[PDB]
Amino acid sequence: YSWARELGLIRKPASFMTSICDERGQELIYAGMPITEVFKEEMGIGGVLGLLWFQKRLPKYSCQFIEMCLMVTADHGPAVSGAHNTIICARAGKDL
Amino acid sequence: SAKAISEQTGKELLYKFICTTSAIQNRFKYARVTPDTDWARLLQDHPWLLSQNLVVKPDQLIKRRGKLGLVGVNLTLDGVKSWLKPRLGQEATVGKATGFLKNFLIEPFVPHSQAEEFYVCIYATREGDYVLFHHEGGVDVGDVDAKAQKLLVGVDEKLNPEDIKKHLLVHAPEDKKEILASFISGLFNFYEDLYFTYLEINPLVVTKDGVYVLDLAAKVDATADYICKVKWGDIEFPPPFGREAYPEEAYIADLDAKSGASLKLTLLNPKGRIWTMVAGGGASVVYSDTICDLGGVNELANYGEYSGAPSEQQTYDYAKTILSLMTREKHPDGKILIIGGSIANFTNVAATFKGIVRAIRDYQGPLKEHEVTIFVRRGGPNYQEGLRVMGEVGKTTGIPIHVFGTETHMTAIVGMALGHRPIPKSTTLFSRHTKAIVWGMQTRAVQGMLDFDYVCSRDEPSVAAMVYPFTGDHKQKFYWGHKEILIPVFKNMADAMRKHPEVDVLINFASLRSAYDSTMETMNYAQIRTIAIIAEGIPEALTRKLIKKADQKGVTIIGPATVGGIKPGCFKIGNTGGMLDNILASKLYRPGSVAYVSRSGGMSNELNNIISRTTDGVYEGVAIGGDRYPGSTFMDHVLRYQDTPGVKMIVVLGEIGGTEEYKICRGIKEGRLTKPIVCWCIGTCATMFASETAVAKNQALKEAGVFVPRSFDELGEIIQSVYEDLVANGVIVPAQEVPPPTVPMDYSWARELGLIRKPASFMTSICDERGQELIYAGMPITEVFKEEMGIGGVLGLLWFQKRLPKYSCQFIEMCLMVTADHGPAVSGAHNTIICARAGKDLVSSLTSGLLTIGDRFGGALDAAAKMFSKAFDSGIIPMEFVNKMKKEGKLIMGIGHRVKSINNPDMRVQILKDYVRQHFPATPLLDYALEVEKITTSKKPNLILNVDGLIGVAFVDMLRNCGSFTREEADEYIDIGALNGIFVLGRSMGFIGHYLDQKRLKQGLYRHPWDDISYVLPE
Amino acid sequence: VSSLTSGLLTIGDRFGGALDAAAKMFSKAFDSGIIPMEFVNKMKKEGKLIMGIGHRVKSINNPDMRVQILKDYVRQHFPATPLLDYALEVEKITT
Ligand SMILES: CC(C)(COP(=O)(O)OP(=O)(O)OC[C@H]1O[C@@H](n2cnc3c(N)ncnc32)[C@H](O)[C@@H]1OP(=O)(O)O)[C@@H](O)C(=O)NCCC(=O)NCCS
Ligand SMILES: Nc1ncnc2c1ncn2[C@@H]1O[C@H](COP(=O)(O)OP(=O)(O)O)[C@@H](O)[C@H]1O
Ligand SMILES: O=P([O-])(O)O
Ligand SMILES: [Mg+2]
């Protein structure tokens, strides 16, 4: 199959479809932007999230805002439903 | 098709459903008599049989019964019995039909004058339903077509009562005009509402007392069953009067009825030396015709066909019937088997041939004894290899088999077998710019179209969008050569039309049930100018309505019951021409000068082959479909071809029945048709069963100037002669040949022909869902239940791939039961509850809890088993073990309890301990553990062997000593965590229990109280 | 536990949903009082497929063994099966 496909003798439709990231290249690509450009352009976590989630280069204010959201939602004590379960679980000797 | 019903069936429906002011007399007053009739029972159900004098007649689709002395009139019940004595069960010859008189009808005698007898008839035609009336009814009606008053009721038109009275009842007695008008009106509404195509009452009697339906002959459109099932009930369609079916005919009829495939068989001469096993309704006729043309009419043994993709098994069952039938008695000159067919559309030729090859191997002894010679001719996907298996079975058995392909003319094998020859509206519908919408989820058809487009060197794909009402709007992946492209799929046709104004063609793959409505809907979008209706089985009355709307809107309808057509280099309707290999083989990627029109789809594929081999190729070809009323006729297309400059000659493949072919004679006469026309009508043999005959039409066409061959065999030769003459006269300037673009083979297909191998990325050994039955580790699911395995047994198969002893299975079930739950205070239950309370679903809530299982919660079973196994296997004595653990600063896993002690035992442990002792052959590890317990309880009384420890060591003893596992196997299962699986599976029940409970208890969101939290944050 | 959960987390909608879906759908239809044929057509009109109807290979001539096993147990031991009776009538129409 590998060989027949190389010589373009047979066609087989792909079962999967992606559009967020391409690891196959010389360089890693996040939604069309190569990883070096991501750092060079100083995107940040917000910027990277814009490419992977929306496949868009967002304005700086937008990125900074996303980062701000992530910061305020980071934690709200151990009394909440989720924190409680994680604590119970950690205490029951489980992994991260 | 339109099918005849019995007089009883018709009368029953009429009495049940006719709505009229007219009082219909003797309603439901009929009794049926067969040779198996219980007269006592008959009289019990019909006491009216003694009330008055009667009439008796056969109800077997015998016409002119009175003239044949087959109607016993004005008889007492005794007289009726006396009349039946010499007739019931007797053989009778009515014209050229000979059969038995088996079914009769008894009705009350209606005294009346000849003046009180009338004739009424309604019948369907393309243009509507004709209503006929005659004041001189009876057995002496004569030529009713010229004599009777007649009126056409158009398509979707109402029968006006004023018109009945004014035009139909002109010669009716004045006093009976209102009652007749009222009855005829009700009869017409009845005729429409129950989907009749023919209804005749001869005579209809109207006396001073009321209306009497003395006789009734009717046909219904059988395809309307899906609508009318409720009113029709278990309606029976009687076969015409004549001989009854041989047991072999009945067998094949049963196979046909129980499958989507077409399997037909009729014996002509059981003692004939010529047997046929032909694929396709069209080809079967053609072969039968050729045999008759070569004088074999008296030696032809059968008429039959197989089509619609039958399974290898069905093909085998069909073939064995033929082979059985031909090896009953020897013939001095031996026998012949003609295994023919046209070019198959998509079905792999090797598949059906495997069934036939199996039948030949089973009947090789009788076939050699009866000196049978087999002739094969078939085309289609991978026909080359299908012909190889045929040639090979001939060599291995010794039976003479002569195998031929597409290169041989279809009917050439006949002459070879007999030893006569040696064995060697709008004019344009489509353009290269045509864009279509496909109604339905037809991935293969769309891809087929797109491969034709690519190979035709079209700039864009011919399919713009698809309409599939069950899914939401999405895009489907397809291939433009080797490049993947996306085609939009719409839930609503309105959206497809809106987003694609460039589309003017619609290909309708809607089922026969929804074809009508989807076509009518399409006609509300003016952009659509051509509609191809694929569906076979649309009721005639509905197709007429489609025709009417299309005609008034100028929409060209191709179909119903068609594959479509093909315009080489431009457009291909759906599945026309089949796989690329056939499109390439018959050079359909580039246009020629020859245009054709056919009824049969199969024959269109054969015509593509014929034309490509004899001429410069096909310009445009159309299959008009096989329904009674095609949307577009032979003439419709012939005129388009006459008016297309690129068309230099026309080929028409006609058929027996209808008078369409005569419009061509007329067209030529009138000087409208000037282009050379080649025509051959199939069904020249059918006259061995007047203007409508194939023989009559072929004669008329030849006289009109049409080029008509002697037989179907000479069709290739005549086409080539016409073509060569047109080249010689410079009418045809053939173009230089350009090679088409190449497209890769489909992986699916390559894998089928075993051309490529691709290694599996995965490996399984627990279950196989691919089979005819589900298999759990080698044991089929039915055996699982038959052997009464239970949950324990099933777990043994899926987890260990072993058939365990019953006591082992029962023990596993016991473990699952004790581990099921242990209250809501435990880590896992708590999380599930929290989760359920936070409004999550079952799976999220369960998993949230299960994710706590492993170390400090639920770990103990695996831990205990591992610890004790290690200690035991190391050979240290229990006391040495206890002290070793103390020194290492470790507690024993599976030892200790909060309240339970040596004097106050744990019930779960008691239950299990007792079962294990009683049923397990050996328990060495349990014995060792219990000895450790003797030591620890002597320290503190609550240092008992707990349920986790008990299950752990019991399970190890079960694996090691049940005798299903080697030590290696038993030790691997423990290590890979089989014991964790037990706890997880077991407790999963309890957790689902809690989830349901919290939802049922309508428990709100949990927030942990701050009072229970010690906040120790930095400063 | 991680491996099991990873798989279980796919259960719910397009995978494993059918049991719940079928039970809900048929109960609704039965309880609403509509006759099987009315139900079949209602679904078609609404653009919905019947949950618990259809098979890739198995047909009315080639039955599913699991369905055979279960149908037969239920017929034998259940005092009353009105919804099953209703569903089998819907199956008569769809097949
Ligand atoms: C001495 C005393 C404080 C503690 O005794 P205890 O609870 O029985 O002792 P422990 O908690 O250490 O447990 C007993 C043993 O069980 C062992 N053990 C506990 N759980 C175990 C497990 N799961 N697996 C293996 N061993 C286990 C411990 O290792 C310990 O072993 P050791 O005796 O060799 O050290 C207690 O008995 C006491 O209060 N006695 C009263 C004496 C008195 O009258 N005092 C004077 C007042 S006048
Ligand atoms: N029940 C009846 N009462 C009186 N006359 C009847 C009755 N049934 C039939 N007849 C007469 O017998 C004739 C022949 O019967 P019919 O049903 O028309 O058979 P066919 O037309 O096939 O010969 C009728 O034309 C009519 O005169
Ligand atoms: O049966 P066909 O010849 O119309 O395909
Ligand atoms: Mg008559």
SS (HEC) of A63-93: HHHHHHHHHHCCCCCCCCHHHHHHHHHHHCC
For the CA of B66, the nearest atom of ligand 2: 23
Find residue B941's DSSP bridge partners.
Answer: none
Tell me which of A1, A9, A85 to substitute to probe the interface with B (most B C-beta atoms closer than 10 Å).
A85
Q: What is the dihedral of CA B539, B544, B546, B549, to 10 degrees?
A: -160
Collapsing DSSP to helix, strand or coil, B122 comes out as: strand
CB atoms within 10 A of CB B749: 17
Question: What is the C-alpha separation between C70 and C62, in angstroms, rounded?
Answer: 16
**B711: nearest Cα among B291, B358, B413:** B291
Question: What is the C-alpha separation between B867 and B860, in angstroms, rounded?
Answer: 10
CB atoms within 10 A of CB B904: 11
Question: What is the C-alpha separation between C55 and C95, in angstroms, rounded?
Answer: 11
Question: What is the C-alpha separation between B146 and B136, in angstroms, rounded?
Answer: 13
Do the chains contact at B854 and C1, CB–CB below 8 Å? yes
Do the chains contact at B841 and C12, CB–CB below 8 Å? yes
- By DSSP bridging, strand B530-533 and strand B505-508 are parallel
Q: What angle do CA B681, B682, B685 make, to 5 degrees?
A: 125
Q: Which ligand is nearest to the CA of B944?
A: 1
Do the chains contact at B827 and A92, CB–CB below 8 Å? yes
Question: What is the C-alpha separation between B609 and B411, in angstroms, rounded?
Answer: 13
Amino acid at B338: I
Contact of B999 with chain C, judged by CB distance below 8 Å, is answered with no
Contact of C1 with chain B, judged by CB distance below 8 Å, is answered with yes
Collapsing DSSP to helix, strand or coil, B200 comes out as: strand
Do the chains contact at B857 and A93, CB–CB below 8 Å? yes
Amino acid at B556: T
Please provide residue B456's backbone torsions phi and psi, each rounded to the nearest 5 degrees. -80, -5
Instruction: Output DSSP code: residue B669.
Output: H
Question: What is the C-alpha separation between B841 and B581, in angstroms, rounded?
Answer: 53
**A77: nearest Cα among A91, A87, A65, A66:** A87
- By DSSP bridging, strand B128-134 and strand B149-153 are antiparallel
Do the chains contact at B1005 and A81, CB–CB below 8 Å? yes
List the chains bordering chain B where 3 or more Cβ pairs fall under 8 Å.
A, C
Find residue B438's DSSP bridge partners.
Answer: B466, B507
Do the chains contact at B746 and A8, CB–CB below 8 Å? no
**B279: nearest Cα among B227, B332, B234, B339:** B339
Please provide residue B151's backbone torsions phi and psi, each rounded to the nearest 5 degrees. -150, 130
Do the chains contact at B850 and C9, CB–CB below 8 Å? no
Collapsing DSSP to helix, strand or coil, B610 comes out as: helix
Half-sphere exposure of B635 (CA within 13 A, CB side): 12
Do the chains contact at B782 and C65, CB–CB below 8 Å? yes
CB B262 within 8 A of CB B581: no
Is B65 marked within a binding site?
Answer: yes
Scanning every residue of chain B, which has its alpha carbon at the shortest distance from the alpha carbon of A88? B827
Contact of A61 with chain B, judged by CB distance below 8 Å, is answered with no
Q: What angle do CA B124, B234, B45 make, to 5 degrees?
A: 115
Atom 13 in ligand 2: residue holding the nearest Cα: B66
- By DSSP bridging, strand B779-780 and strand B775-776 are antiparallel
Q: Which of B469, B841, B847 lies nearest to residue C47, judging by beta carbons?
A: B469
* Both structure tokens of B849: 């809890």
**Tokens 């069904």 identify what position?**
B683
**B642: nearest Cα among B596, B675, B593:** B675
CB B609 within 8 A of CB B586: yes
What residues have CB less than 8 Å from B395, skipping those under 6 apart? none
- By DSSP bridging, strand B483-490 and strand B463-467 are parallel
Could you give the residue ranges of the DSSP H alpha helices within B744-873?
Answer: 747-752, 781-786, 790-795, 806-818, 827-837, 842-850, 860-873
Chain B, window 484-513: residues with a beta carbon less than 8 angstroms from a chain C beta carbon: 491
Question: What is the C-alpha separation between B652 and B680, in angstroms, rounded?
Answer: 7
CB atoms within 10 A of CB B1011: 6
Question: What is the C-alpha separation between B981 and B808, in angstroms, rounded?
Answer: 16
The helix-helix angle for B7-17 and B225-232 (nearest 10°) equals: 80
Tell me the CA end-to-end span of chain C in Å, nearest whole number.
Answer: 42
* Both structure tokens of B509: 């793959």
**Tokens 């003459």 identify what position?**
B725
Q: Which of B750, B830, B1010 lies nearest to residue A10, judging by beta carbons?
A: B750
Q: Which of B477, B482, B1009 lies nearest to residue A8, judging by beta carbons?
A: B482
Ramachandran quadrant class, B360 (left: phi over 0; alpha: psi -120 to 50; beta: rest) = alpha
- By DSSP bridging, strand A21-22 and strand A29-30 are antiparallel
Distances (CA, A) of B899 to B809, B890, B896: 31, 22, 9
Choice from B7, B107, B214 to test ligand 2 binding pocket (greatest atom count within 8 A of CB):
B214
How many residues belong to chain B? 1019
**B650: nearest Cα among B574, B705, B711:** B705
How many residues belong to chain C? 95
Could you give the residue ranges of the DSSP H alpha helices within B743-825?
Answer: 747-752, 781-786, 790-795, 806-818
Amino acid at B788: E
Distance B823 CA to ligand 3 centre (A): 70
Chain B residues with CB under 8 Å of C11 CB are 843
Tell me the CA end-to-end span of chain B in Å, nearest whole number.
Answer: 92
Scanning every residue of chain C, which has its alpha carbon at the shortest distance from the alpha carbon of B847? C5
Question: What is the C-alpha separation between C45 and C36, in angstroms, rounded?
Answer: 14
Positive/negative CA dihedral, B931, B936, B941, B945:
negative
* Both structure tokens of B523: 């006609």
CB atoms within 10 A of CB B880: 12
Q: What angle do CA B438, B440, B443 make, to 5 degrees?
A: 80
List the chains bordering chain C where 3 or more Cβ pairs fall under 8 Å.
B
How many residues belong to chain A? 96
**Tokens 């080359």 identify what position?**
B384
Experimental method: X-ray
Contact of B785 with chain C, judged by CB distance below 8 Å, is answered with yes
CB atoms within 10 A of CB B187: 26
Find residue B992's DSSP bridge partners.
Answer: none
Question: What is the C-alpha separation between B131 and B159, in angstroms, rounded?
Answer: 9
**Tokens 């199939």 identify what position?**
B682
Q: Which of C4, C47, C69 lies nearest to residue B470, judging by beta carbons?
A: C47
Starting at the earlier edge strand, list the strands of the sheet with B54-58: B31-33, B104-108, B54-58, B72-75
Atom 1 in ligand 3: residue holding the nearest Cα: B281
CB B180 within 8 A of CB B202: no
* Both structure tokens of B943: 């240092």
User: Where would I find the beta strands (DSSP E) of B669-769?
Assistant: 677-682, 745-746, 767-768
Question: What is the C-alpha separation between B657 and B949, in angstroms, rounded?
Answer: 88
The helix-helix angle for B978-1000 and B947-961 (nearest 10°) equals: 130
Find residue B720's DSSP bridge partners.
Answer: none
Q: How buried is C46 (Cβ within 10 angstroms: 0-12 exposed, 13-18 middle, 19+ buried)?
A: exposed
For the CA of B940, the nearest atom of ligand 1: 8
Question: What is the C-alpha separation between B363 and B629, in angstroms, rounded?
Answer: 44
Which residues sit with their C-beta closer than 6 Å to ligand 1? B 886, 891-892, 895-896, 936, 939-940, 943
Question: What is the C-alpha separation between B530 and B570, in angstroms, rounded?
Answer: 15
Find residue B300's DSSP bridge partners.
Answer: B274
Question: What is the C-alpha separation between B232 and B225, in angstroms, rounded?
Answer: 8
Radius of gyration of chain C (CA): 16
CB atoms within 10 A of CB B266: 13
Amino acid at A94: K
Cis before B203 (ω within 30): yes
Question: What is the C-alpha separation between B951 and B954, in angstroms, rounded?
Answer: 5
